Amino acid sequence: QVQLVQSGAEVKKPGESLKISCKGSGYSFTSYWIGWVRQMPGKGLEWMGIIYPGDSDTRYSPSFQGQVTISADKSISTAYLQWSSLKASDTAMYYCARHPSPYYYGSGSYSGGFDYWGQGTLVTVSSASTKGPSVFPLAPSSGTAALGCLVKDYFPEPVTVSWNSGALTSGVHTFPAVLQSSGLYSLSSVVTVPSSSLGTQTYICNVNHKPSNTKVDKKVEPK
Amino acid sequence: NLCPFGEVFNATRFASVYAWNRKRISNCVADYSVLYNSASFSTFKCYGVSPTKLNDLCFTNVYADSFVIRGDEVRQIAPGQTGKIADYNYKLPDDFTGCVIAWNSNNLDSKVGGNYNYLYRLFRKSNLKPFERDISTEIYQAGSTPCNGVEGFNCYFPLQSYGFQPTNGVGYQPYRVVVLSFELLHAPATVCGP
Amino acid sequence: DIVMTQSPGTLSLSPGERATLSCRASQSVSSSYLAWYQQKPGQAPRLLIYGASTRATGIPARFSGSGSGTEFTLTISSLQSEDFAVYYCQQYDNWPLMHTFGQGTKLEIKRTAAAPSVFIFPPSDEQLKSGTASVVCLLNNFYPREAKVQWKVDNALQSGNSQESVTEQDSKDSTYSLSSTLTLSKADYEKHKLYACEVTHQGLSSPVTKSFNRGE
Ligand SMILES: *[C@@H]1O[C@H](CO)[C@@H](O)[C@H](O)[C@H]1NC(C)=O
Numbered sequence A: 001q002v003q004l005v006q007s008g009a010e011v012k013k014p015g016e017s018l019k020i021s022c023k024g025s026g027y028s029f030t031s032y033w034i035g036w037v038r039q040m041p042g043k044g045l046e047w048m049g050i051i052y053p054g055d056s057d058t059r060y061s062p063s064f065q066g067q068v069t070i071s072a073d074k075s076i077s078t079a080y081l082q083w084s085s086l087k088a089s090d091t092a093m094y095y096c097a098r099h100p101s102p103y104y105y106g107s108g109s110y111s112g113g114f115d116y117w118g119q120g121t122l123v124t125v126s127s128a129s130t131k132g133p134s135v136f137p138l139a140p141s142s143g144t145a146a147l148g149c150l151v152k153d154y155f156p157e158p159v160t161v162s163w164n165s166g167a168l169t170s171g172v173h174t175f176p177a178v179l180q181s182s183g184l185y186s187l188s189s190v191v192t193v194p195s196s197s198l199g200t201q202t203y204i205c206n207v208n209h210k211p212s213n214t215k216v217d218k219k220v221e222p223k
Numbered sequence B: 001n002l003c004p005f006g007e008v009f010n011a012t013r014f015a016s017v018y019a020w021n022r023k024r025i026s027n028c029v030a031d032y033s034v035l036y037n038s039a040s041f042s043t044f045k046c047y048g049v050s051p052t053k054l055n056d057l058c059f060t061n062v063y064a065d066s067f068v069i070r071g072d073e074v075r076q077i078a079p080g081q082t083g084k085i086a087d088y089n090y091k092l093p094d095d096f097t098g099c100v101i102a103w104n105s106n107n108l109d110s111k112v113g114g115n116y117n118y119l120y121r122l123f124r125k126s127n128l129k130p131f132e133r134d135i136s137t138e139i140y141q142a143g144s145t146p147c148n149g150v151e152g153f154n155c156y157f158p159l160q161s162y163g164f165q166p167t168n169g170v171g172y173q174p175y176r177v178v179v180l181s182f183e184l185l186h187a188p189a190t191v192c193g194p
Numbered sequence C: 001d002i003v004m005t006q007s008p009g010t011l012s013l014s015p016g017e018r019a020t021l022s023c024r025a026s027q028s029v030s031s032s033y034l035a036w037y038q039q040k041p042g043q044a045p046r047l048l049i050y051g052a053s054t055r056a057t058g059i060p061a062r063f064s065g066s067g068s069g070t071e072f073t074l075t076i077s078s079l080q081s082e083d084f085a086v087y088y089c090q091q092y093d094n095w096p097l098m099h100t101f102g103q104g105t106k107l108e109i110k111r112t113a114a115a116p117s118v119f120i121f122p123p124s125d126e127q128l129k130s131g132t133a134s135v136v137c138l139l140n141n142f143y144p145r146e147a148k149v150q151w152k153v154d155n156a157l158q159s160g161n162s163q164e165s166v167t168e169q170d171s172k173d174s175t176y177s178l179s180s181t182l183t184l185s186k187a188d189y190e191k192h193k194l195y196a197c198e199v200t201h202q203g204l205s206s207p208v209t210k211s212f213n214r215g216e
Helices: B071-076 B084-088 C186-190
Strands: A003-006 A010-012 A018-025 A033-039 A046-052 A057-060 A069-073 A078-083 A092-099 A121-125 A134-138 A144-154 A160-163 A172-174 A185-194 A204-209 A214-219 B021-025 B043-047 B061-070 B098-104 B119-121 B159-161 B174-183 C004-007 C010-013 C019-025 C034-039 C046-050 C063-068 C071-076 C086-091 C105-109 C117-121 C132-142 C148-153 C162-166 C176-185 C194-200 C208-213
Touching (some): A003 A092, A018 A033, A185 C132, B061 B071, B071 B084, C019 C086, C071 C086, C132 C148, C132 C194, C148 C176, C176 C186
Parallel strands (some): C010 C105
Antiparallel strands (some): A092 A121, A134 A144, A204 A214, C004 C019, C086 C105
């Protein structure tokens, strides 16, 4: 089985250097090219560069030439992508992907394109520091009612929100976080529920922020 | 069941080196001393493997490449070699693990009137990568003036014909060559010996 | 050297229909070295076509790539639920020196209109303690996505102070949900009393307003 694995998510400060890795297995790593592709949040794919690990023949896009360095270590079947001084505009998902040349015949037939992709390495470059979230209720009042919790002011991302320890799943909507101008994230998790259950069912939202090891449960009652 | 080596070694037709053929050998037992104990091979050298210790060893994937080149070009069928064939037609990696087998085939690949169906790539803008098979026919720009896809002076069809007349020198006579590739991956073995 | 332009930008279709996706090149990709990819939310892209017309291993036959020169096309004949995603085209004509993607084309499941069930929320005192007031307006289970959410504070237009976040199409009923969060300071929260959220949508006969008075 062919597998490309990328290193974990990165949260950095502007000016810091960063190196991320892409390790392949299940095939001759030196025989296929490895490309790097950028996907800024909510945007399309951009080709950054490509490297042939057999001899480290490296080719960059002119938009990334000198911006970044692409290398490889044959002995551990790993391709690298590294910045010398990260910038806020570098916040993006970074994919490594295997690309057989249009001439490569190692399988007995021709192939093309980025046929296998890594799961991506999320890179967040911000001036903000690690901070747990602040949880506030969205209370219902005045035969279906909506209630939830406002998970505000937290960094870096992500946060998970469950209801009643994962028992209340129907009707839940955990919204995508937005980037406050404060360089800090915030979202809301809502859930619609019968209005007759307001006095007959307790509703607890379970918020978890692994970067700050902040795990809080808030009860949500009529105002 | 035994590995079908006769399908490639004993094949009636061989490919031109530029469009070399690849046959993957899988799910079978391979007796290599049968091949090693044949006096009918001009060349049979192995890299990264002992040819005797090959009957007691397993590999994840085994490939058999076959093509026709000149006798004096068999040297180019080796890791790290340089020349028209090794750089533009068939390149082996530096860490190649396998065996290169060749024999004279002037009897089969050069009849009365020569044989001009065997081709090789004489020109390329860059060297091949290992195990690449370039079958394109872009007109090659040898000089300063651009070509624009038309043949002319300094603008050549990239594939050139081998001579292969029956009374050529031994080094310009056609040779049939089979390359066995022994790839070892952290994966189940598909080819072993007795 | 070569620019790739995809058309259209976004398209809404039901299943069973045919999707015709175009990909333009500023020069001629005379090698037909063009590929098509599919990307679903929170997932790496997946190779569908290479060489402009050859399907990758495992790709169903409803995906067909065509074209040469400057126009290339990805045709998906019998759309299924799992087909609605983003699609990209790649050129790699000058191998290995230059690759270029198109901006992408988003496929969107068509569905019956669904009206947004609007809810409004005031701050919870415990938030007001910290000197900041967030004013949440929730739009739940609606289609299509286009919804016009305007905030009245004492019946005056608000601009530049609300953030709105949309969910993805639900896996089961294909509807959208929208949250709109106004953020103001505590002083600016108490200089006013009426907080209203007016919602305009195809599925509503008239704009619906959910309002409240501070301290009530
Ligand atoms: C090809 O056929 C010949 C018969 O002349 C035989 O001696 C040889 O072993 C065969 N090659 C194989 C089985 O690889």
